[PDB]
Design an enzyme around this catalytic site. Structure first.
Site, PDB file in Angstrom:
ATOM      1  N   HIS A  41     -13.041  13.559  30.663  1.00  0.00           N
ATOM      2  CA  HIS A  41     -11.976  13.144  29.703  1.00  0.00           C
ATOM      3  C   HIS A  41     -12.585  12.738  28.350  1.00  0.00           C
ATOM      4  CE1 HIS A  41     -12.262   8.806  31.302  1.00  0.00           C
ATOM      5  NE2 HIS A  41     -12.223   8.602  29.979  1.00  0.00           N
ATOM      6  N   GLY A 143     -14.355   1.887  26.606  1.00  0.00           N
ATOM      7  CA  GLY A 143     -15.706   2.444  26.399  1.00  0.00           C
ATOM      8  C   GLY A 143     -16.635   2.223  27.582  1.00  0.00           C
ATOM      9  N   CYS A 145     -16.158   3.640  30.502  1.00  0.00           N
ATOM     10  CA  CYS A 145     -16.102   4.865  31.349  1.00  0.00           C
ATOM     11  C   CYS A 145     -17.474   5.529  31.397  1.00  0.00           C
ATOM     12  CB  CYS A 145     -15.084   5.883  30.863  1.00  0.00           C
ATOM     13  SG  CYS A 145     -13.376   5.352  31.131  1.00  0.00           S
TER      14      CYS A 145
END
Lengths: 306, 306
Positions: A41, A143, A145
């Site tokens: 993503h 942030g 991820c």
């Protein structure tokens, strides 16, 4: 003496964290040998996340669109592919700090350490459990991820989790390092919900055993019970049903305390029925289900890593 | 989103842990530049610990009596001295992994990360607070002594604690890295006790603020209070008295929640008086006092280290 949620040492994993940017989107990736792994993503804009077609979005992208940064050094992307919900970026530089490592898909009620990162920089370390409903109760700001979950077996890092998303409850979902989600979650910004959050009975027992070994014994009683009798009381409180394996797994704690597992179940039944009456166990006014038998053994045997 | 007891990354500290042996006694030491630091009770036999004269015991000892091992490599001791309750062993090899570092004596109600070690090998990482009575509630099995407490400010490690001993309650005492104990503890095996364990009011408030920011608001009320009115209720429950500094320190949380500190005190008074009624805050059925305002900011701002 004493008992804490303690994480594995993060050192071997710190040296694997990099920063991955596409356009305006930055998140963390895992640099092992000459591959960086991150959540796919990263190729999505704030618009795309509603209903992304990842295959289609990836077609607009070339190797030079992926800004991979290791500390303050840019890595060169010589190849890219999508494995389920992860991107594998091939870089020409092998990570000289790559530890001995493996990828494991972890079972619900197992625990692991998370190294939470922002912009490829480690922020902090904590312990988590994969909950029966395949969510985790972590700490993950924007942030975070591509932050990873791991265990350490002697010298070997076993990566089990990559962070991807937060659910409406404030709990967390992600993938194994092959990019399959834990549970029925998908990487799109729609209304998804976790199932019922059940309790990991075996872990609650491990914790009671930890308590005893550390001098807290007030919750011990004169009673025993049966597996079937206990599970009748489990069902009511959304506890996982207990099995003989679970009993066998607690034998080393049973052994070292001289307390049959069934007598400890009888103590637990009594706590589920009567509550705690404002008493504490290892400074908790609730039943803790995020220690495995293995976690408790380690911390009441004192094993190390090299 | 979410809120966890999270430790600093342990990587920079892992590379400083060594094993120190005298006779039959092994514990951990801290290898910075060409000095190893460890608890001086390494020179004690099981007999000596009753009433040791350390000066006298040290006189029987030469540089070649100190077996310092870094992973699987023996270091050469070219000098030894005693600074209060720590031994400084001078080795000819400077630690090539020495991070930028400083020694700080930490204030009660401040937090730090512990890297628990056995035989110079890291075992695990967890967060601790220096309690108002200068004890810590850690996890320290036999051979954990010389395990160290630390904070990380940008790139710089600030060492604040070295583990030495466990008290009859199962709680823990040690020194700063200059070897002065926190509290009135001495390194001998006699009957010593901690004072009354007071609660770190300012930290409890920081935690309530964390809860709100993470959606838990059930404990919010319609009331405010005064500093003096609140402290009348503190005294009763062995909470630390609150001051204007404490208020000022919570301003960034006050600011970001739009909730005056005094309204949050009113919520806290109500919880001390009425208890929790079997409700939870960030999955705790008790008031948590081991997060500083700074800890909460970090974890609701998302700062990193390099």
């Amino acid at each position: 003496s004493g008992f804490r949620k303690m994480a594995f040492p993060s050192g071997k994993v710190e040296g694997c964290m990099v920063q991955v940017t596409c356009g305006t989107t930055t998140l963390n990736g895992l640099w092992l040998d000459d591959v960086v792994y991150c959540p796919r993503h990263v190729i999505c804009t704030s618009e795309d996340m509603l209903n992304p077609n990842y295959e289609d979005l990836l077609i607009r992208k070339s190797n030079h669109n992926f800004l991979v940064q290791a500390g303050n050094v840019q890595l060169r992307v010589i190849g890219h592919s999508m494995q389920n919900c992860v991107l594998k970026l091939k870089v020409d530089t092998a990570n000289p700090k790559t530890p001995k490592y493996k990828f494991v898909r972890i079972q619900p009620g197992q625990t692991f350490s998370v190294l939470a990162c922002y912009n490829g920089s480690p922020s902090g370390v904590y312990q988590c459990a994969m909950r029966p409903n395949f969510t985790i109760k972590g700490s993950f700001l924007n942030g975070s991820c591509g932050s990873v979950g791991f265990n350490i077996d002697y010298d070997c890092v076993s990566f089990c989790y990559m962070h991807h998303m937060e659910l409406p409850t404030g709990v967390h979902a992600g993938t194994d390092l092959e990019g399959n989600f834990y549970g029925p979650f998908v990487d799109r910004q729609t209304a998804q919900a976790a199932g019922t959050d059940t309790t990991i009975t075996v872990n609650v027992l491990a914790w009671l055993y930890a308590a005893v070994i550390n001098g807290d014994r007030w919750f011990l009683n004169r009673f025993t019970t049966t597996l079937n009798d206990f599970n009748l009381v489990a069902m009511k409180y959304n506890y996982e049903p207990l099995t003989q394996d679970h009993v066998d797994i607690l034998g080393p704690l049973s052994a070292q305390t001289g307390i049959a597992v069934l007598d400890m179940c009888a103590s637990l039944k009594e706590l589920l029925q009567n509550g705690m009456n404002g008493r504490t166990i290892l400074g908790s006014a609730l039943l803790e289900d995020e220690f495995t038998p293995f976690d408790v053994v380690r911390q009441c045997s004192g094993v190390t890593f090299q």
